[PDB]
Amino acid sequence: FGVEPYGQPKYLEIAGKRMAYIDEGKGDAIVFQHGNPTSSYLWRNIMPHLEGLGRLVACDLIGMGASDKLSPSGPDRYSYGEQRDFLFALWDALDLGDHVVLVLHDWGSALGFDWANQHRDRVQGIAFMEAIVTPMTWADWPPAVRGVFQGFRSPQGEPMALEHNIFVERVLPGAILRQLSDEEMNHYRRPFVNGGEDRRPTLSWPRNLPIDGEPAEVVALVNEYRSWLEETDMPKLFINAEPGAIITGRIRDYVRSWPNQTEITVPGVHFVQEDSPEEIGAAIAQFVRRLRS
Ligand SMILES: [Br-]
């Protein structure tokens, strides 16, 4: 498990904010998108497997990784919709072309599925793991973290995230099978070392999860993109995790009904990149070679 980032950050000003990304290599774009509470760093041991298969791009969501913080920050900031406005504008600016393979996790999957559904002609394939693929109930959510996520989705969320940094310090390591090295953990901590609003994105994200019908706008979004994913003949790569976290049980059965789909299974809970990067990397490379072939 390599500890260094895959590339050095590059920056573009988007809508009044500097956003950070990795962009290495040439050819058709392979775009990796992290979710909460991670950054492009999550992909550092996976991207090498895609060398020579395209232009490898991994963006840091607004407020996350090396991307700027929104200001003034507060409970109305970093909604799905605002994260989308910033990321979609970044992807537009980067001139990704029209043969994009998306490699998606967590909220990166909601964003990337939405983007593909809105740019169907530009997407060649989607690989996804531990993704948001359908509206949920708490029974779908890992038992071990129900209480913590209900707390985030309440007024207790502010002290949990902004004061105590619980998403970074507890949720992240609790959903990795191995133990991160201190150096790896401190790469995850970096964007969030300051108590207070720097940690807002880690709180806004759980508040957007589509659970028991709320928030309704996100439930609506997921229902729209999932209807496309059911029907589309776009090639898919489903990277299932064991035991997994958010794609388990009935949700896993549901994903397995999608057409034109390759499956792999690798060990992991939620942050599967930190347990099985070689296997994930190999599988994405085989998928992309097939799509080029
Ligand atoms: Br979340």
Curated annotation (Swiss-Prot):
Function recorded in the entry: Catalyzes hydrolytic cleavage of carbon-halogen bonds in halogenated aliphatic compounds, leading to the formation of the corresponding primary alcohols, halide ions and protons.
GO CC list: peptidoglycan-based cell wall; plasma membrane
An example Gene Ontology molecular-function term: haloalkane dehalogenase activity
Complex formation: Monomer.
Leading EC class: hydrolase
Active site: D106 (nucleophile), E130 (proton donor), H270 (proton acceptor)
A Pfam short name: Abhydrolase_1
Entry superkingdom: Bacteria
Domain AB hydrolase-1 residues, every copy: 29-152
Protein's gene: dhaA
Protein name per the record: Haloalkane dehalogenase 3
